[PDB]
Scaffold this active site. Structure first.
Site, PDB file in Angstrom:
ATOM      1  N   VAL A 289       0.833  -1.199   0.000  1.00  0.00           N
ATOM      2  CA  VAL A 289       0.000   0.000   0.000  1.00  0.00           C
ATOM      3  C   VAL A 289       0.870   1.251   0.000  1.00  0.00           C
ATOM      4  CG1 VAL A 289      -1.456   1.376   1.525  1.00  0.00           C
ATOM      5  CG2 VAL A 289      -2.132  -0.952   0.927  1.00  0.00           C
ATOM      6  N   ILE A 292       3.396   1.866  -4.883  1.00  0.00           N
ATOM      7  CA  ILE A 292       2.481   2.355  -5.915  1.00  0.00           C
ATOM      8  C   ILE A 292       2.185   3.828  -5.654  1.00  0.00           C
ATOM      9  CG2 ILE A 292       0.434   1.791  -7.263  1.00  0.00           C
ATOM     10  CD1 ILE A 292       0.284  -0.851  -5.749  1.00  0.00           C
ATOM     11  N   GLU A 294       1.075   7.659  -5.468  1.00  0.00           N
ATOM     12  CA  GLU A 294      -0.177   8.271  -5.889  1.00  0.00           C
ATOM     13  C   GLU A 294      -0.001   9.638  -6.534  1.00  0.00           C
ATOM     14  OE1 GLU A 294      -2.458   8.561  -2.294  1.00  0.00           O
ATOM     15  OE2 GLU A 294      -1.203   7.060  -1.298  1.00  0.00           O
ATOM     16  N   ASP A 336      -0.202  18.385 -46.434  1.00  0.00           N
ATOM     17  CA  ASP A 336      -0.919  18.467 -47.647  1.00  0.00           C
ATOM     18  C   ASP A 336      -0.155  19.594 -48.256  1.00  0.00           C
ATOM     19  OD1 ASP A 336      -2.867  18.268 -49.667  1.00  0.00           O
ATOM     20  OD2 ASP A 336      -4.165  19.718 -48.692  1.00  0.00           O
ATOM     21  N   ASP A 630      -6.067  20.413 -44.701  1.00  0.00           N
ATOM     22  CA  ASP A 630      -7.338  21.111 -44.547  1.00  0.00           C
ATOM     23  C   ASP A 630      -8.452  20.481 -45.379  1.00  0.00           C
ATOM     24  OD1 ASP A 630      -6.223  21.943 -46.999  1.00  0.00           O
ATOM     25  OD2 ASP A 630      -7.448  23.764 -46.981  1.00  0.00           O
ATOM     26  N   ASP A 634      -7.015  14.794 -46.359  1.00  0.00           N
ATOM     27  CA  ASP A 634      -6.203  15.170 -45.209  1.00  0.00           C
ATOM     28  C   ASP A 634      -6.885  14.774 -43.908  1.00  0.00           C
ATOM     29  OD1 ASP A 634      -4.695  16.379 -47.246  1.00  0.00           O
ATOM     30  OD2 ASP A 634      -5.706  18.305 -46.940  1.00  0.00           O
ATOM     31  N   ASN A 724       5.562  11.648   4.990  1.00  0.00           N
ATOM     32  CA  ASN A 724       4.720  11.390   3.826  1.00  0.00           C
ATOM     33  C   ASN A 724       4.323  12.682   3.128  1.00  0.00           C
ATOM     34  OD1 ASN A 724       4.658   8.584   3.746  1.00  0.00           O
ATOM     35  ND2 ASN A 724       2.931   8.439   5.174  1.00  0.00           N
TER      36      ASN A 724
HETATM   37  F1  BEF Z   1      -3.224  19.320 -51.594  1.00  0.00           F
HETATM   38 BE1  BEF Z   1      -4.051  18.937 -50.326  1.00  0.00          BE
HETATM   39  F2  BEF Z   1      -4.665  17.551 -50.614  1.00  0.00           F
HETATM   40  F3  BEF Z   1      -5.170  19.948 -50.027  1.00  0.00           F
HETATM   41 MG   LIG Z   2      -5.757  21.088 -48.826  1.00  0.00          MG
END
Ligand code: BEF
Ligand SMILES: [Mg+2]
EC number: 7.2.2.10
Length: 891
Positions: A289, A292, A294, A336, A630, A634, A724
């Site tokens: 006890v 472990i 806390e 992207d 976006d 994506d 403690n």
């Molecule tokens: F070029 Be990403 F797919 F908007």
């Molecule tokens: Mg895009």
């Protein structure tokens, strides 16, 4: 009737207009009636799909409660309850309540911030019903409705086009193609209908109409469109477990195994000695006890909540704490291109005049911000006649209009409008009256207008044309040079062609401009370079990430040339790199993909399934892969990826939901700030874990040794309570709140197989524990050789243990830097806590009331100095080890 079976964009593209209309029972001219629309809406519902289905707060509370460390905490609480350990159970339940309350509050605040940031206006739709055009909301659409599309209109639902003239639709949201796709009403062959971008007879929901007029019939509403299949795929992939959660589970399993080992060891020792079974078993369970710890969940939650708050202050909302941890321990970052790596806003960057002058234009987006520089000089208004004539030609011969930084028209024309705005010539259009207009067409590939000045109507008519160089140069007979009109020669035409080819080789789109009295005898003005430039502050961020040991890859659905040019501009492409298309990705399987994808860095024409496959292949090698985007492909990439980064302005609702952090200002400095914060959080967690493990091991060993032989528990209850408090209290929180070092954030990313509990940390913990227990045992040995028990022994042991804990915490303040390298002050909270604890100890061992309460005695100055000196070997040995490691490092 027939319940109106929904037609997919594939089949709708294959079948002709008449067949689709007959199947959908749609009246192309007179439209639908209200009764039929209501009947079809009763089954198919509204044009909506449920996004972010939010469960009540109790479900989130239970989800935050579900944690293996939390389950271990409740297990320990109940096993202490069965043995009437009220204080331990109270501490465990208080820690659990605090942790879950902090997590729930942070998640609720993040959800509220996400809801407030994402403000959505209900879109409208132009449709005909009963035979008369009336504007309905996008939700009211039903299959078979005839929808009219105009310039600047947003497509509300999938449409089968039957009437369209010069229609251009911007599909960068769905396909990532920067160039708008021309739309034709003819049916498409099945052989060429494989790709989404090839569906030129289908209008997709959520796309923006940039030019032309269209008339289509709804074929799919709600989740049956192309924005519904991607959502279904999004809610069909399980996000992978974060490395932080895996490390927490591994540490909890290690702690459970360590507790089992120690109780078994104590059982064996008691059996060997000959003590009774029941009392030894109770002592073993009490020691378990006491094990472990806390405070680990409290420290982890507090540090991660502070990191989340800091990220919020840096314009970044984070859904989860393991999310920011994953960003901190990221290895490969993908992107992207159209949208997060580029502004998705065509802007003129290079201007070439007929006289041979080269002009560079700065700034991005459809805003007046930016300057035109010619030979190091800023040009404004009509300063340079050559550039001014080109700007006037591009501005007067322009039908695109930008309002509130929103472009209505062709992106190339918007680039010219923005270029004119940067020069302070936004109002040039209002100064002319367009008498005759020739519009831009694919066959002609040029557009010319005839106009006269408002206040100079007596002036002769002047005609300006814009378009491709080949078509414009046919109508050009003379050229301007330093204010003089000279006949256009073959050498000048060759020079212009050379310049056009040079600009095209850099990824710039070439547009030709001319001006003159009448068509055919125009004067050539020059060429303008139009490109979709990357976002500001992205090249430096990419260079810093590459130099930091993090690979950057580009995945997009655009053309190969645009992706190659963007990667070369950002530094992701060279003369020896290779590009892999989506068909090549779909060609091989497993092994060849694993050999190919890490070597390559540029992906073009990739479907959402291709992006998901690439993400899975990258995850197969074990590297932590990041992606920002976006779009919907994506979005499914972030859903398949461990970490999800989105954009709060140009992103969509699906992309934001699929992600895990939303960027407000669309920056990467925030991303590397999150990386640094995660690295600092990991370092603080490691240091706190090491310190707490060492302290717990030393305390458990000392208690077991004391209980083992003769003297039962030579410490009072108040002393135990204060001990403690010290180890698992304000010192622990201050150690867990350690700030971010300037050297721990300039390191290569942590490997996947790396864990918190390493051999060096274990060795340091063991060394500190044995040193502490040796010092305490020597003190107790001197006090037992005194052979008197007059609270002096108890108070000496109490002070020795307190000082050992303080010195261990000071040593564990840092794991790499020395004591005199981070600053003695450092954390003000740590200094306050240690000062308060030391004054409390002084009052306990000095004030007669507190001395009687704690059963202590008086200590002289010499004894206090000797105690301070003796309980310093842990710090000295740790500093010596750190110095030795530092030497050898560089060495
Ligand atoms: F070029 Be990403 F797919 F908007
Ligand atoms: Mg895009």
């Amino acid at each position: 009737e027939t319940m109106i079976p929904v037609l997919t964009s594939k089949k709708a593209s294959e079948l002709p207009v008449s067949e689709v209309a007959s199947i959908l029972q749609a009246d192309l001219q007179n439209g639908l009636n209200k009764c039929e629309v209501s009947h079809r809406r009763a089954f198919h519902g509204w044009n909506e799909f449920d996004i972010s289905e939010d469960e009540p707060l109790w479900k989130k509370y239970i989800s935050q409660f579900k944690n293996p460390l939390i389950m271990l905490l409740l297990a320990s609480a109940v096993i202490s309850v069965l043995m009437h350990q009220f204080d331990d159970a109270v501490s465990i339940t208080v820690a659990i309540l605090i942790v879950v309350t902090v997590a729930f509050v942070q998640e609720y605040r993040s959800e509220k911030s996400l809801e407030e940031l994402s403000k959505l206006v209900p879109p409208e739709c132009h449709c005909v019903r009963e035979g008369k055009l009336e504007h309905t909301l996008a939700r009211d659409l039903v299959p078979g409705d005839t929808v009219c599309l105009s310039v600047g209109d947003r497509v509300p639902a999938d449409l089968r086009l039957f009437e369209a003239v010069d229609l251009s639709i911007d599909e960068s949201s769905l396909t990532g193609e920067t160039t708008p796709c021309s739309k034709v009403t003819a049916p498409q062959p099945a052989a060429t209908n494989g790709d989404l971008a090839s569906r030129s007879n289908i209008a997709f929901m959520g796309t923006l109409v940039r030019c032309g007029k269209a008339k289509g019939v709804v074929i799919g509403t709600g989740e049956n469109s192309e924005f519904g299949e991607v959502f279904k795929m999004m809610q069909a992939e399980e996000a992978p477990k974060t490395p932080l959660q895996k490390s927490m589970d591994l540490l909890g399993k290690q702690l459970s195994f360590y507790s089992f080992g120690i109780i078994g060891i104590i059982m064996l020792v008691g059996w060997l000695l000959g003590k009774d079974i029941l009392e030894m078993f109770t002592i073993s369970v009490s020691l378990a006890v006491a094990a472990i710890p806390e405070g680990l969940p409290i420290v982890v939650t507090v540090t991660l909540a502070l990191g989340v708050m800091r990220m919020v202050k840096k314009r970044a909302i984070v859904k989860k704490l393991p999310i920011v941890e994953t960003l901190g321990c990221c290895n490969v970052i993908c992107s992207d291109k159209t949208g997060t790596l580029t502004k998705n806003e065509m802007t003129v960057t290079h201007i070439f005049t007929s006289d041979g002058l080269h002009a560079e234009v700065t700034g991005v987006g459809y805003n007046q911000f930016g300057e035109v520089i010619v030979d190091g000089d800023v040009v404004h208004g009509f300063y340079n006649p050559a550039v001014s004539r080109i700007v006037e030609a591009g501005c007067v011969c322009n039908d695109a209009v930008i309002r509130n930084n929103t472009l209505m028209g062709k992106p190339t024309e918007g680039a010219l409008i923005a270029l004119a705005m940067k020069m302070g010539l936004d109002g040039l259009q209002q100064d002319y009256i367009r008498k005759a207009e020739y519009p831009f067409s694919s066959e002609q590939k040029w557009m010319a207008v005839k106009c006269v000045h408002r206040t100079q109507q007596d002036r002769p008519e002047i005609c300006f044309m814009k378009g491709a160089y080949e078509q414009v140069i046919k109508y050009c007979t003379t050229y301007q040079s330093k204010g003089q009109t000279l006949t256009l020669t073959q050498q000048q035409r060759d020079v212009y062609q050379q310049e056009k080819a040079r600009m095209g080789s850099a990824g710039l789109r070439v547009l030709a401009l001319a001006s003159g009295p009448e068509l055919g005898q125009l004067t050539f003005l020059g060429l303008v370079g139009i490109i979709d430039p990357p976002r500001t502050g992205v090249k430096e961020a990419v260079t810093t990430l590459i130099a930091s040991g993090v690979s950057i890859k580009m995945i997009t659905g655009d053309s190969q040339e645009t992706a190659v040019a963007i990667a070369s501009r950002l530094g992701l492409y060279s003369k020896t790199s290779q590009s892999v298309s989506g068909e090549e990705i779909d060609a091989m399987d497993v092994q060849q993909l694993s050999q190919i994808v890490p070597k390559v860095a540029v992906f073009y024409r990739a479907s959402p399934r291709h992006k998901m496959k690439i993400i899975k292949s990258l995850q197969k090698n074990g590297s932590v892969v990041a992606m920002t985007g976006d779009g919907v492909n994506d979005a499914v990439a972030l859903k398949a990826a461990d970490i999800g980064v989105a954009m709060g302005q140009t992103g969509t609702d699906v992309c934001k939901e699929a992600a895990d952090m939303i960027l407000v200002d669309d920056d990467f400095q925030t991303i590397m700030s999150a990386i640094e914060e995660g690295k600092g959080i990991y370092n603080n967690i490691k240091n706190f874990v090491r310190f707490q493990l060492s302290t717990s091991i030393a305390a458990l060993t000392l208690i077991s040794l004391a209980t083992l032989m003769n003297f039962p528990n030579p410490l009072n209850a108040m002393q135990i309570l204060w001990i403690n408090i010290i180890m698992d209290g304000p010192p622990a929180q201050s150690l867990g709140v350690e700030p971010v070092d300037k050297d721990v954030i300039r390191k290569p990313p942590r490997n996947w197989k790396d864990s918190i509990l390493t051999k060096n940390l274990i060795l340091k913990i063991l060394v500190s524990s044995i040193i502490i227990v040796c010092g305490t045992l020597f003190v107790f040995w001197r006090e037992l050789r005194d052979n008197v028990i007059t609270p002096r022994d108890t108070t000496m042991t109490f002070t020795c243990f307190v000082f050992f804990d303080m010195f261990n915490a000071l040593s564990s303040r840092s794991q790499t830097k020395s004591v005199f390298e981070i600053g003695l002050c450092s954390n003000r909270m740590f200094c306050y806590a240690v000062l308060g604890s030391i004054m409390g100890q002084l009052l306990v061992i000095y004030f007669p009331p507190l001395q009687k309460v704690f059963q202590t005695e008086s200590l002289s100055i010499l004894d206090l100095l000797f105690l301070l000196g003796l309980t310093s070997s842990v710090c000295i040995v740790a500093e010596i080890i750190k110095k030795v490691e530092r030497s050898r490092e560089k060495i």
